[PDB]
Amino acid sequence: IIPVEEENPDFWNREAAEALGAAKKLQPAQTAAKNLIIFLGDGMGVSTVTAARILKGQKKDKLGPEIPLAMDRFPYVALSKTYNVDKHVPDSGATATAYLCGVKGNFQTIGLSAAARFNQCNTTRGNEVISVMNRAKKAGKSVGVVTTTRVQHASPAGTYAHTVNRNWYSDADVPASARQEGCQDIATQLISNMDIDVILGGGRKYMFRMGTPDPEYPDDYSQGGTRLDGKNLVQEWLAKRQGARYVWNRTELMQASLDPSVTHLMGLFEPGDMKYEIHRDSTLDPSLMEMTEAALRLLSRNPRGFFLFVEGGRIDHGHHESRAYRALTETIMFDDAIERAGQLTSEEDTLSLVTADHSHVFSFGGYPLRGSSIFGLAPGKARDRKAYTVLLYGNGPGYVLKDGARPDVTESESGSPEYRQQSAVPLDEETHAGEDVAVFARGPQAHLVHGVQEQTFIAHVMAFAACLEPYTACDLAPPAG
Amino acid sequence: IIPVEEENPDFWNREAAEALGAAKKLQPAQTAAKNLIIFLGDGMGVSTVTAARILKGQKKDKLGPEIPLAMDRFPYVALSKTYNVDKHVPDSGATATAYLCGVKGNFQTIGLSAAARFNQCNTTRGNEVISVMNRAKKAGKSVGVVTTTRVQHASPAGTYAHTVNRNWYSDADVPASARQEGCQDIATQLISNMDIDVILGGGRKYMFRMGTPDPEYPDDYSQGGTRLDGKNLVQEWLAKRQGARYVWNRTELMQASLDPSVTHLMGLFEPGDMKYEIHRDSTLDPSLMEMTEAALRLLSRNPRGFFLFVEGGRIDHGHHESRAYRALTETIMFDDAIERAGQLTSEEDTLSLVTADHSHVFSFGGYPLRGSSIFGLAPGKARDRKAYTVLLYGNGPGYVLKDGARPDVTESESGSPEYRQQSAVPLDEETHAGEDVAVFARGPQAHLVHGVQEQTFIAHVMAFAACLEPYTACDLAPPAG
Numbered sequence: 020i021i022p023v024e025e026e027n028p029d030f031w032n033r034e035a036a037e038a039l040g041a042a043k044k045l046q047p048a049q050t051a052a053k054n055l056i057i058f059l060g061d062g063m064g065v066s067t068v069t070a071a072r073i074l075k076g077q078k079k080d081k082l083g084p085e086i087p088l089a090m091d092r093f094p095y096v097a098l099s100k101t102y103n104v105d106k107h108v109p110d111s112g113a114t115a116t117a118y119l120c121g122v123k124g125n126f127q128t129i130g131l132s133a134a135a136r137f138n139q140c141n142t143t144r145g146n147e148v149i150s151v152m153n154r155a156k157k158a159g160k161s162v163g164v165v166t167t168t169r170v171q172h173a174s175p176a177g178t179y180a181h182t183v184n185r186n187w188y189s190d191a192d193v194p195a196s197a198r199q200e201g202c203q204d205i206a207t208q209l210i211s212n213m214d215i216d217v218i219l220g221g222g223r224k225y226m227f228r229m230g231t232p233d234p235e236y237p238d239d240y241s242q243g244g245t246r247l248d249g250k251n252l253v254q255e256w257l258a259k260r261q262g263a264r265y266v267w268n269r270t271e272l273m274q275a276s277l278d279p280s281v282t283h284l285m286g287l288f289e290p291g292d293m294k295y296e297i298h299r300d301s302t303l304d305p306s307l308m309e310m311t312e313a314a315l316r317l318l319s320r321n322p323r324g325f326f327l328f329v330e331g332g333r334i335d336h337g338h339h340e341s342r343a344y345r346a347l348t349e350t351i352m353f354d355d356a357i358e359r360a361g362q363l364t365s366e367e368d369t370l371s372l373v374t375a376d377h378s379h380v381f382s383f384g385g386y387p388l389r390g391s392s393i394f395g396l397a398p399g400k401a402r403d404r405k406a407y408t409v410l411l412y413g414n415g416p417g418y419v420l421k422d423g424a425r426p427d428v429t430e431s432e433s434g435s436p437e438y439r440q441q442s443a444v445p446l447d448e449e450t451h452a453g454e455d456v457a458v459f460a461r462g463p464q465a466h467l468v469h470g471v472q473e474q475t476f477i478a479h480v481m482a483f484a485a486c487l488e489p490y491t492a493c494d495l496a497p498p499a500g
Numbered sequence: 501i502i503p504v505e506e507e508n509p510d511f512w513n514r515e516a517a518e519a520l521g522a523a524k525k526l527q528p529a530q531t532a533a534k535n536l537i538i539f540l541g542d543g544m545g546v547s548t549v550t551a552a553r554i555l556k557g558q559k560k561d562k563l564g565p566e567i568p569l570a571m572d573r574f575p576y577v578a579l580s581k582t583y584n585v586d587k588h589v590p591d592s593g594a595t596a597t598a599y600l601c602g603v604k605g606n607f608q609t610i611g612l613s614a615a616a617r618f619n620q621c622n623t624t625r626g627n628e629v630i631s632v633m634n635r636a637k638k639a640g641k642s643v644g645v646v647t648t649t650r651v652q653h654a655s656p657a658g659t660y661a662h663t664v665n666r667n668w669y670s671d672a673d674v675p676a677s678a679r680q681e682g683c684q685d686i687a688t689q690l691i692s693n694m695d696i697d698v699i700l701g702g703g704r705k706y707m708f709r710m711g712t713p714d715p716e717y718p719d720d721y722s723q724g725g726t727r728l729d730g731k732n733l734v735q736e737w738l739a740k741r742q743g744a745r746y747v748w749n750r751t752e753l754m755q756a757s758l759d760p761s762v763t764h765l766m767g768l769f770e771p772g773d774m775k776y777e778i779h780r781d782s783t784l785d786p787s788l789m790e791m792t793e794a795a796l797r798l799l800s801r802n803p804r805g806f807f808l809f810v811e812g813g814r815i816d817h818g819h820h821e822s823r824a825y826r827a828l829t830e831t832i833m834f835d836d837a838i839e840r841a842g843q844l845t846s847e848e849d850t851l852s853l854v855t856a857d858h859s860h861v862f863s864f865g866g867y868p869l870r871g872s873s874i875f876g877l878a879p880g881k882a883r884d885r886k887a888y889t890v891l892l893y894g895n896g897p898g899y900v901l902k903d904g905a906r907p908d909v910t911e912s913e914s915g916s917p918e919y920r921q922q923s924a925v926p927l928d929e930e931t932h933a934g935e936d937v938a939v940f941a942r943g944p945q946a947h948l949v950h951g952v953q954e955q956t957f958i959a960h961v962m963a964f965a966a967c968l969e970p971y972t973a974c975d976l977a978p979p980a981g
């Protein structure tokens with residue numbers, strides 16, 4: 020459909036004039052950032068962003084592509100080069116090292132330089148690289164990790180852990196030789212490496228000994244504790260801190276986030292990853308946006324500021340399943356969380372970066388009409404006289420041959436939350452993609468986010484803006500009020 | 501392969517420190533742009549850019565992803581929203597209207613507001629939107645159109661033409677009713693609508709009457725003149741201007757570009773589109789980089805400055821064939837032309853924008869090792885136990901079923917210049933993609949290129965920087981020396 024108002028050149032001329040005016044108004048801060056927020060859309064490449072924009076636009080009864088996402092309103096944009104040292108198409112572990120520690124590493128390692136080797140515990144020591152979040156804590160800031168994945172997953176783990184193997188969630192995952200050599204599982208590192216004021220997400224199971232019933236699924240043993248060392252990491256964590264509270268559900272999170280006496284908060288809301296937003300139990304589980312607000316309630320209390328990590332962690336997972344409906348609905352909730360954080364913090368003193376660790380082989384094509392569903396069919400048949408979808412994958416589990424040929428697709432089918440878009444190559448999981456991702460930035464020193472940068476730049480600009488090591492001689496004035 | 505130097509965190513810390521220093525040094529101009537250059541990579545989305553970077557990096561005996569493209573060195577980056585008014589996934593015609601005239605239009609129309617309708621001649625009048633190039637000419641600047649496609653193709657046509665139908669190359673293409681109603685073919689508009697100082701690219705055939713032997717293929721009648729109105733548009737064009745020269749080959753282009761008496765230059769180097777760079781006859785045909793230099797030699801003579809359009813027009817075509825080797829080799833030559841223009845002009849007085857009209861459903865995935873060929877196989881077999889390529893398409897003519905199944909692929913095969921990467925959906929031509937593309941900017945007022953913008957912003961920022969209508973009251977100081 021053609022919006023009548025857009026037929027008039029004046030519409031476009033007025034908008035562009037408005038855009039130029041806004042562009043001219045942009046000025047760099049002379050002051051430091053009190054607070055640092057990184058919003059990480061795991062797997063949220065450029066094609067995910069645009070597709071999510073269209074979906075969200077239509078959610079609010081608009082045509083789609085013309086409505087800005089919250090992230091679209093960020094003034095400063097750069098392209099981020101995501102390659103790991105050893106692989107062109109990266110993983111979450113080694114990209115975390117780049118955007119959180121400012122050093123590139125090798126595929127599937129976390130918080131380690133590329134002198135380390137994956138799954139070789141004895142290459143660990145001397146290669147630990149300290150995250151910006153760790154450095155923010157050392158400077159007396161409060162720090163928060165918020166994600167819809169396990170809190171021990173690769174991305175959040177980049178804020179606190181150093182490991183040659185991202186799969187080492189609990190001691191149960193670490194080979195005897197590595198345990199003997201002192202390589203700690205990530206759940207242990209979560210509670211031991213550094214003080215973290217707010218930890219919100221999934222990953223209950225790795226914190227408790229085998230046999231421990233999950234409090235929310237006490238009748239499903241696969242959801243229970245995983246530990247073989249007899250440790251209760253939650254109790255150990257609680258015992259280390261006065262003001263500390265552990266919650267496993269939304270109601271308790273709410274109570275804690277408003278409780279003046281709660282100084283340390285660990286909320287682990289599922290045994291593993293949190294449910295997709297479309298499957299979330301809104302009585303039992305906080306959304307990413309709600310966890311973000313909960314984190315902000317506690318973190319904002321520290322006069323010295325905070326570092327907050329917020330991950331749209333299951334965007335990635337949606338794409339891996341080649342279920343764009345899940346990828347994009349996670350992306351919109353991620354954008355809602357970004358919007359909410361913006362309402363609760365001031366760009367006068369808060370440097371906010373939105374980025375992705377890497378992209379996916381997700382594409383948005385065909386020649387669909389303005390206002391058509393992103394989950395719809397491309398107008399016109401493919402060369403095999405069957406329909407195809409506007410959303411497709413290069414590879415992944417949507418590759419199907421029914422009776423020797425590519426199956427036809429209907430709108431009802433293509434529009435289902437369970438639908439897997441077709442791909443060129445069958446894989447159990449769709450792969451990451453290696454192309455540049457966006458960095459969006461707002462707040463003090465955000466203007467430094469520019470051009471085409473190595474992914475490591477994200478960590479460095481944040482450390483610089485807050486005058487953290489190695490930029491304590493930042494030469495910036497104190498954060499603005 | 502893991503580069504030893506990258507194993508040391510110092511390598512990454514030093515680079516990022518260097519990046520921060522460079523970022524801090526950036527300052528906005530207070531002065532206008534004397535010259536305007538738009539480099540348009542047709543179809544050159546984010547995944548094309550990164551893939552081209554890797555290929556070019558390895559061309560110069562490096563690992564790939566760590567080596568900047570010429571365009572990567574541009575300080576200012578924005579994301580551009582490419583939707584046409586009527587379609588989410590756009591064409592070149594209506595995107596040209598946006599980035600050249602500053603108004604969005606309807607799919608397959610050029611230089612017209614969205615009140616016009618495709619292929620309806622009688623909806624033309626009153627909807628003409630004037631390009632920045634036209635406005636630059638009105639202000640006394642010299643103007644140049646340089647492309648590897650027909651000069652009457654959608655992109656270059658956006659600089660000078662207004663038509664409801666991009667397919668109207670010569671009068672032979674225009675229906676009788678439209679001819680009767682005064683809708684001029686693009687070749688006529690090329691010579692009639694405005695004065696253009698330099699016109700370089702393909703499209704000889706549309707300029708000459710049927711029966712006219714092409715001077716370069718006088719034995720292939722399909723390459724001859726197409727016109728049914730008896731017009732020789734080249735002679736008509738030459739007759740309109742003293743100092744005017746027509747060339748159809750590289751040697752004559754060279755001579756003209758250095759000739760002080762040549763004030764108007766039309767070089768049409770193929771009957772239709774120019775050959776892919778990999779097929780170019782370097783004795784008969786100028787590369788895009790050479791045409792760019794030829795254009796610059798003449799355009800730079802005007803003390804009032806110039807507007808130059810330079811298109812990597814066949815990047816798009818490579819992707820349509822799903823032959824990434826062609827898409828990416830065109831992209832590298834486009835980047836070489838960008839580099840060359842930068843050596844021949846000063847960012848003190850020249851605003852240079854590099855962008856794409858739209859992207860393609862091209863993806864870069866699998867998990868290939870550092871330094872591996874971009875045209876190589878993903879490590880490890882697909883779910884069907886056959887190999888697959890790191891480069892794939894969502895749709896297009898690389899979809900194959902040999903004997904009921906996805907064919908295996910070898911490195912020798914995947915690496916051929918004729919190889920079509922596989923896709924999920926068979927189409928004669930791979931489709932454009934609707935996701936945001938990059939805008940890169942350098943020079944006076946380039947800092948205004950920021951954030952996420954409508955594609956129309958490209959035209960407006962250029963007009964504003966040069967203080968052209970509708971921004972003659974730009975409030976900028978004269979261009980710097």
Ligand SMILES: *[C@@H]1O[C@H](CO)[C@@H](O[C@@H]2O[C@H](CO)[C@@H](O)[C@H](O)[C@H]2NC(C)=O)[C@H](O)[C@H]1NC(C)=O
Pocket residue numbers: 139141142
């Ligand atoms: C990490 O530990 C492994 C396992 O013992 C070491 O690998 C051995 O190295 C020796 C000497 O090169 C070889 O002869 C053996 O074949 C290796 N054993 C295995 C099981 O692979 C390795 O050298 C250690 N690396 C460091 C940094 O100490």
Ligand SMILES: *[C@@H]1O[C@H](CO)[C@@H](O[C@@H]2O[C@H](CO)[C@@H](O)[C@H](O)[C@H]2NC(C)=O)[C@H](O)[C@H]1NC(C)=O
Pocket residue numbers: 267268270271302303
């Ligand atoms: C959220 O978690 C709280 C804290 O564990 C749960 O509160 C317990 O509920 C049981 C059963 O109703 C009671 O016997 C206890 O008094 C509660 N424990 C504490 C320490 O408060 C609560 O039930 C959970 N909410 C939901 C909806 O499951």
Ligand SMILES: *[C@@H]1O[C@H](CO)[C@@H](O[C@@H]2O[C@H](CO)[C@@H](O)[C@H](O)[C@H]2NC(C)=O)[C@H](O)[C@H]1NC(C)=O
Pocket residue numbers: 620622623
């Ligand atoms: C453009 O020309 C076409 C062709 O004559 C016009 O279309 C006709 O419009 C009348 C009135 O609505 C219809 O009864 C006919 O069916 C149409 N004919 C065809 C061939 O489609 C159209 O109205 C013209 N538009 C303008 C702006 O004048």
Ligand SMILES: *[C@@H]1O[C@H](CO)[C@@H](O[C@@H]2O[C@H](CO)[C@@H](O)[C@H](O)[C@H]2NC(C)=O)[C@H](O)[C@H]1NC(C)=O
Pocket residue numbers: 748749751752783784
């Ligand atoms: C490039 O174009 C020029 C100009 O048309 C060609 O020059 C002509 O060549 C023919 C055959 O050799 C001569 O009879 C004429 O004297 C030339 N014409 C003019 C006006 O100079 C030239 O041959 C072309 N070059 C190539 C390599 O084909």
Ligand SMILES: O=[N+]([O-])c1ccc(O)cc1
Pocket residue numbers: 229230231232233237238239240243
């Ligand atoms: O032994 N276990 O793992 C158990 C036992 C009881 C229960 O409700 C849950 C788990």
Ligand SMILES: O=[N+]([O-])c1ccc(O)cc1
Pocket residue numbers: 269272273274276277305308309310312313314316
């Ligand atoms: O847990 N919290 O602090 C919350 C919970 C729900 C909500 O809507 C906002 C904040």
Ligand SMILES: O=[N+]([O-])c1ccc(O)cc1
Pocket residue numbers: 710711712713714718719720721724
């Ligand atoms: O009639 N024609 O189109 C012709 C005739 C002669 C020739 O060499 C080329 C084309």
Ligand SMILES: O=[N+]([O-])c1ccc(O)cc1
Pocket residue numbers: 750753754755757758786789790791793794795797
């Ligand atoms: O036609 N030209 O002006 C040219 C031709 C070739 C070249 O290498 C540079 C410029």
Ligand SMILES: [Ca+2]
Pocket residue numbers: 235267268288289303304
């Ligand atoms: Ca739960």
Ligand SMILES: [Ca+2]
Pocket residue numbers: 716748749769770784785
């Ligand atoms: Ca030629």
Ligand SMILES: [Mg+2]
Pocket residue numbers: 061111168172173174175330332335
């Ligand atoms: Mg993650």
Ligand SMILES: [Mg+2]
Pocket residue numbers: 542592649653654655656811813816
């Ligand atoms: Mg083009």
Ligand SMILES: [Zn+2]
Pocket residue numbers: 061062110111335376377
């Ligand atoms: Zn990831």
Ligand SMILES: [Zn+2]
Pocket residue numbers: 062111335336339451
């Ligand atoms: Zn992933």
Ligand SMILES: [Zn+2]
Pocket residue numbers: 542543591592816857858
């Ligand atoms: Zn195009």
Ligand SMILES: [Zn+2]
Pocket residue numbers: 543592816817820932
């Ligand atoms: Zn195209």
